[PDB]
C-alpha cells in the first residue's frame, strides 16, 4: 500500500469514479444520490374485475417415534395448490386480476419451506408486481414445454432439502394481470404522491421518478412516452388532468480546476454542493463560491 484516498468528499468521489488520483481541468458529469425511502404510486384502468387466489400449501410430517432425530428429512410431504385436481386437469386463471400467496404450514421450529425461481422467467412471488399474461397455468404435475420451480426445506445453518416442484405454463399477453391483493377499499386506480421521488407503476409501466401536475390538454391517449420508451406523462381517465414524470436525480456538471471543484451547473434553482452563491444563466443555474470580481 502506497497511499489511499477516502471516497467521502465531492472531489474525492469524482476522483474515485474517474479512478485516478489526478483529474485534468474540465467539466465532469455527476449524478446526485437517490433517496432510498421511496413511496409507491399506482394508477390503473378500472375494468371487469373478478379475482382468484393461487394458494400453494406446503407442510411435511416428521416421524414421531423411536429415532428422535431433528437434523434429518421428514417422512411424508403433501403439497397442494388449492382447487387443483389431478384427474380434472391443470388449474389456471380466467379472471382479469389474481394474486399468488405461499403458505408455509410447517409446524416445526428451526425449520422453513421455500421456493426457488428455477428456469422460469418469473418468480412465484413476483407475479404480484403487475405482470402481464395471456394465459398462465400452474400444476403439481409436469406441463410439457413449461417451467419448473424447485421447492425447498431449510434447517438453520444446515443442509437444505428438495421436497417437490411446481410446473407453470406461460404465454405472456395483455389479458390478465397479477396484483398483490384485493385491498380493503384502498384504490388501485389513482393513488399517487407528488414532488417526491417515488417508485411508480402507472398504467402497467414501472419505474422511479417524480410526478407533477401539468398544463397540457393532450386529447389523445392516456400514456405519453419518449423515443427511448420512458414514461413522460399520463392522464387520469376521470377529470382528465395530465401529469408529468421526471427522474429525481438528473445529471449535473462540475467545473474542476487545479484539482478542486470551483463550480457546478445545476438543473434547478438551489445552492447545491456546498457553494454559497448561485446565479441564473440563460439555460442553466450555476453555483460557486465566486464573487464576480474577476477579469480573466
Amino acid at each position, epitope marked *: 500500500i502506497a497511499n489511499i484516498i477516502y471516497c467521502n468528499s465531492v472531489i474525492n468521489r469524482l476522483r474515485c469514479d474517474q479512478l485516478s488520483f489526478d483529474v485534468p481541468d474540465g467539466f465532469y458529469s455527476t449524478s446526485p444520490i437517490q433517496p432510498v425511502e421511496l413511496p409507491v404510486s399506482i394508477v390503473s384502468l378500472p375494468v371487469y374485475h373478478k379475482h382468484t387466489f393461487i394458494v400453494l400449501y406446503v407442510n411435511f410430517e416428521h416421524r*414421531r417415534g423411536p429415532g428422535k432425530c431433528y437434523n434429518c428429512r421428514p417422512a411424508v410431504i403433501n403439497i397442494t395448490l388449492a382447487n387443483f385436481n389431478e384427474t380434472k386437469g391443470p388449474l389456471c386463471v380466467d379472471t382479469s386480476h389474481f394474486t399468488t*400467496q405461499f403458505v*408455509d*404450514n*410447517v*409446524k416445526l*421450529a*428451526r425449520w422453513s419451506a*421455500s*421456493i426457488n425461481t428455477g428456469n422460469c422467467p418469473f418468480s412465484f412471488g413476483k407475479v404480484n408486481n403487475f405482470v402481464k399474461f395471456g394465459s398462465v397455468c400452474f400444476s403439481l404435475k409436469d406441463i410439457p414445454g413449461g417451467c419448473a420451480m424447485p421447492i425447498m426445506a431449510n434447517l438453520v445453518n444446515s443442509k437444505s432439502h428438495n421436497i417437490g416442484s411446481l410446473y407453470v405454463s406461460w404465454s405472456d399477453g395483455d389479458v390478465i394481470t397479477g396484483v398483490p391483493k384485493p385491498v380493503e377499499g384502498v384504490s388501485s386506480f389513482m393513488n399517487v404522491t407528488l414532488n417526491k421521488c417515488t417508485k411508480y407503476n402507472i398504467y402497467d409501466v414501472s419505474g422511479v421518478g417524480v410526478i407533477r401536475i401539468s398544463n397540457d390538454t393532450f386529447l389523445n391517449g392516456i400514456t405519453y412516452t419518449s423515443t427511448s420508451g420512458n414514461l413522460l406523462g399520463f392522464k387520469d381517465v376521470t377529470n382528465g388532468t395530465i401529469y408529468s414524470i421526471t427522474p429525481c436525480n438528473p445529471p449535473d456538471q462540475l467545473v474542476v480546476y487545479q484539482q478542486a471543484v470551483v463550480g457546478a451547473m445545476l438543473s434547478e434553482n438551489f445552492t447545491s454542493y456546498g457553494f454559497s452563491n448561485v446565479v441564473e444563466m440563460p439555460k442553466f443555474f450555476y453555483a460557486s463560491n465566486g464573487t464576480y470580481n474577476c477579469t480573466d
Partner: antibody
Amino acid sequence: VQLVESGGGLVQPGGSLRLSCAASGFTFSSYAMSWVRQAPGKGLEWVSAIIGSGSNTYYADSVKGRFTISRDNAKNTLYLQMNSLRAEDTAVYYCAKDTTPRPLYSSGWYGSFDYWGQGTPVSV
Amino acid sequence: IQMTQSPSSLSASVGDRVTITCQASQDITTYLNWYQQKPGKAPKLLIYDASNLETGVPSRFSGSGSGTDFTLTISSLQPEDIATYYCQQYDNLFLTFGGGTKVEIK
C-alpha cells in the same frame, strides 16, 4: 445479538400507550415476533403475534378489542399500539423473538422464541 | 387450551433428580418447549420440541413424552439451578403457557 424494549408506565383505564421494542444483530424483517406478558405473581400468557411479512396479526381472546400490533421493517422497530385498558393489564411485557426465519413473502407458523429483552412493566 | 404445572414449588439440593410434568390438557404430540427463569431475569430458552437442548444451556436437562404426559427432568441438580420453569405448546396460533414450577435452595 441485542434486544430491548421501551414505553412502560402507569395510565388510566381506557387510555393509550406506545409500547416499543428494538433489535440489532439479525435480519429483523424475516423473523416472526410475538408479544407475551406476565401479570405480577402469575403465569405467562400470549398476547399478540406478527409474521415476518406483516400481512396478518393474531390476538388473544381476552386481549381482543384492546391492543393492536405492528412493526416498521425499514429501521428495525416493533410496537404494541395499546388502547382501552380495563384493570388487569398490570404486568411485564416482552417482545419475544421467534426462532424460525421465514421468506419475506410467506405466511408461516410460529410460536417458539429464542431471545427475550429486558422486559418492560406496565400498570393501569 | 391450557397446561397445568404441578407441584408449584419444591426445594432441592445439589445432585437430585428433579422432575416436573406439564399436563397440556390435550394431545399436541410434539409441539412444545420449556424455559428457565432465574428470578429477576427475562425468560430464557431451555428445551424445544420437548426434546432439543438449547445450546446456550448445559446438556444436564431432558424431557420426553407422547400425548399429554410431556415432562421435563434434571439428571443431577447443580447448585446454581434455583429457578422457575415454564412450559408452552407451539401447535396453535392461540398458545398458552403453564402455571410454572420451582426448584429452591436447600
